[PDB]
Amino acid sequence: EPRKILVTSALPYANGSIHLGHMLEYIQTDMWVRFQKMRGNQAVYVCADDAHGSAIMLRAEREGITSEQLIDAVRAEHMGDFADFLVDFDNYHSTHSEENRELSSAIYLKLRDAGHIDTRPVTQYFDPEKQMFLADRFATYAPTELKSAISGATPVLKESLHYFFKLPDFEAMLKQWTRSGALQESVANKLAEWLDSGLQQWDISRDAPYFGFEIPDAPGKYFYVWLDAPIGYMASFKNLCARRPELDFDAFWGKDSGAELYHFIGKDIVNFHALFWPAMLEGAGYRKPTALNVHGYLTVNGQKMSKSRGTFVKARTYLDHLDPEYLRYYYASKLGRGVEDLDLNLEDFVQKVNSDLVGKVVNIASRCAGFIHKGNAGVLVGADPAPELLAAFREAAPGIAEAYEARDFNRAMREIMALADRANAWIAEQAPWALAKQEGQQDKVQAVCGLGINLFRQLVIFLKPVLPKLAAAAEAFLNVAPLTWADHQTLLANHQLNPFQPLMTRIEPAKVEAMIEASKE
Ligand code: MET
Structure with a gap:
């Protein structure tokens, strides 16, 4: 019988263009999906834009447009770049969607009634040396607008109630799951540093103003973007099942699911997918992922990508000059x-x-x-x-x-x-x-x-x-x-045979340099 495989890639943020470093992950994923499709398996590839957080508010403000306006323009642009690079999603949704709003709130509410949510006041204090407010760890929250000294009547101490996911409630499960085969050994041992140290409760709420979902029964409190972002995976798939009668949600996300689930991610975001995500899924009643597929990052001519050297190339800038299959093969x-x-x-x-x-x-x-x-x-x-x-x-x-x-x-x-x-x-x-x-x-x-x-x-x-x-x-x-x-x-x-179709012309080095030059800022 065929294999049912649900594959995802990390959700790009809705605050900028896709560059050739991002493209490596989607080409890696798309190629794997297309191979499984050739093998006669049911491989479904879903992704979405990550449209919440202060990341989006900063760009929306920097361009004098609303947050909804920005993410709509950006999602169109991302999907065009991916499609032109032959990355063929089964659905490309958005974390700012009605499915994600309901899924996030239903998951949150279930987890809360099971006793896995905690409320404690977070304090921020003004540090006169560092000249800014610091959080009470026991870092600052990411700024949502563009913007210090101890003023006479200005407080040096903020306080606000926050909502926490009691991640330590799953520490035994996570200590077992992280070494179960879901992670490569290198990945598991670097991740186990958080486990060796001892898991901590996770701050999942942000204060207003915040572009995101509002927390049930907590007026003025919103979910942190990283809370709902991975639920975007389920949301993107749920939205797809409305149009694909052969795709059943429970068949892929039920705890009994005999289907495989894989998340292709970069190494910088393993902790979210390996600690919070599988705990969230288990507590909310869903299956945990089959495996995380973690990848490194891109260098160009031996060095980190440079906007000054013109090696920080937008996907569209590549596509203006070169056949995408060039890069797909090189990466492969x-x-x-x-x-x-x-x-x-x-x-x-x-x-x-x-x-x-x-x-x-x-x-x-x-x-x-x-x-x-x-x-x-x-x-x-x-x-x-x-x-x-x-x-x-x-x-x-x-x-x-x-x-x-x-x-x-x-x-x-x-x-x-x-x-x-x-x-x-x-x-x-x-x-x-x-x-x-x-x-x-x-x-x-x-x-x-x-x-x-x-x-x-x-x-x-x-x-x-x-x-x-x-x-x-x-x-x-x-x-x-x-x-x-x-x-x-x-x-x-x-x-x-039919007449011979043109298949691929040589790469002209002039076009490669024209791409680099077009990317120098
Ligand atoms: C649920 S995957 C989220 C990925 C995140 N937006 C990033 O770009 O790092």
Whole structure:
């Protein structure tokens, strides 16, 4: 039977553009989702904009527009960037939605009646040296407007009631769940620092003015953005189930759920997804996630992204100059099971993509297709010129799937390009361009280029989750139904091809520099 898989990515904040560092997470997630879809599994990919908090109030104020105005414009822009980068969500919702308002309040109310909510007064005191108000830890709250000394009648001591999630109530459960396999060992041991220290109650309320959901029965008190943000996951899925009759909420979020749930996140936000989130789900009556998939961050030419050096590239700025599949492949070629950083070496970016994709994959196709087109009216002739070469492709497939399954895209691209390298070399060894000029060798020409195109179909199957647009164009040329992973098991013989679709041009280094220049501020 197929696997039911609900996959999410972190919800970007609704206060700025998506940049190429953010894009690494969504490309990682989308590629994994597309692979599971090819494998015949029910993989559902949901995300949303994170539209609350002082983060949004600051930008809304900085631009003289309302908070609703900003997040609406921003959600449109984020969805356009993701879509153009071929990141295909099943739903892209918003933490500022009626589903999130009800889910947050229903979860809160259940947790409260179970005794997992606490009320205590937080004190803030003015520090004359640091010249600002500090919180009573026993840091300051994030500012909501743009803005000190001890004034005569001005208080030096604020106080306000806050609402706490009694996270320590789940410490035993969390001590077990964090080491259950849901986290990679590196992740679990870095996270366990909070556990070694002892969990603390979590401040989930903010005072007015705050752009967010109001807390039931606490007038003037709002949920902190990080309280409702992960509930955006459930909200995004609940909103989707209204339009997808085959998707049942309880089937994915009930404690009994036999479905898998994965959160792709960056390493900076593990504590929210690994401590508060699974405690919240268990206390509220839902299943905990199957695993967190944690990733590192992006560097460009060996250094941190620089707005001054022009290596802090907006997704739209990339898309103005370059094919998105360039970057999708480059990321795939370095994305690993680990949690390390990933470097975009711009010179290596051009050499690697041109040599691997255009050179080893696209050119095997266009060269061979031309001979089938001109020499046999476009009918691919079936033959067995190089059985050992073909068997290698068969032997390699389940391993490439294992890499995909385990998020080891690096290994997967490696295995694929090794097959590409070997197939390409055999074609060159045959030299159909030379056989085509010899009289009485036309059968040989079609035998060779038939295998060539067959192997290109195999490479497209293997690369489809990285290059879904290229795959679509390839399926048009190959004149086949959309490719499943199981299609690798069959071959085209005696098959009418369509005209050759353009698949990918080389990366022009001028365009890469034009992208960097456009990003210098
Ligand atoms: C529920 S995931 C929230 C992610 C958060 N908005 C961030 O950008 O770090």
